[PDB]
Symmetry: C3
Subunit: 103 residues, 3 copies
């Protein structure tokens, strides 16, 4: 699958090893080997979310299958927590859309 | 909903207050409170449109519902006009795709 | 149609004339006049692909029709080869998704 993150936090607030960590995390969460994963992080964006430009993140995960409700819940929790902790965004400001990359 | 704008106009040609204005506009147009809106503007892009790299904009609006034909018309008019006026792009060079964010 | 390319190769590794070339290529491949084509190239991205941050490219082609299997094959070959040659990415590191822009 492919995980895209669009964020208004500065490029310098992104830790060394963040793309590697996130990559390993998705590999754990999805049960897919790192070989089937792509991560794309885009910092320094001009964005408003729920009315303000406080730190936020619009993300999307694209898979070649339909994710189930339990997976959605488990992915969002894991992914929002990772993003809020490492990039310091309030959990309620990280939004994730799931797309059936082949549907 | 979420409105994404990809444009080749420079970051400095984007006015102070543009994200706030656009945000308020979408809130008016859609009847949704600013709380349910996200705007993402990406300037300085390398893009050609109808063959040239004259100023242009590729945008997409993502909603959790199907937009009707009258809404599409009303959204495009309002949104293209706002973008052409504030960012100085010819109206025929602003393209908007509508996605049913949950379909 | 619209062809989007997200790549981790530097902006300076992108040749003068690349957007014009790619544009003409899509016009040839699809049988559509340059007027119906848009190209968007985004370099300098933070991305991992199959586990590493070696040069790669995540792309998507959006059309107002369903592409057939022969077209997919023909588009991928042409497009991956163009991208690998001009931007120096290993062919197995260029991924292209096809979307029915109006479906």
């Amino acid at each position: 699958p492919a995980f895209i993150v669009n964020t208004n936090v500065p490029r310098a607030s992104v830790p060394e090893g963040f793309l590697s960590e996130l990559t390993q995390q998705l590999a754990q969460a999805t049960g897919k080997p790192a070989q089937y994963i792509a991560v794309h992080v885009v910092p320094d964006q001009l964005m408003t979310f729920s009315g303000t430009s406080d730190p936020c993140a619009l993300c999307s995960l694209h898979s070649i299958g339909k994710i189930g409700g339990a997976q959605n819940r488990n992915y969002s929790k894991l992914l929002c927590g990772l993003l809020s902790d490492r990039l310091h965004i309030s959990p309620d400001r990280v939004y994730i859309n799931y797309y059936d990359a082949n549907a």
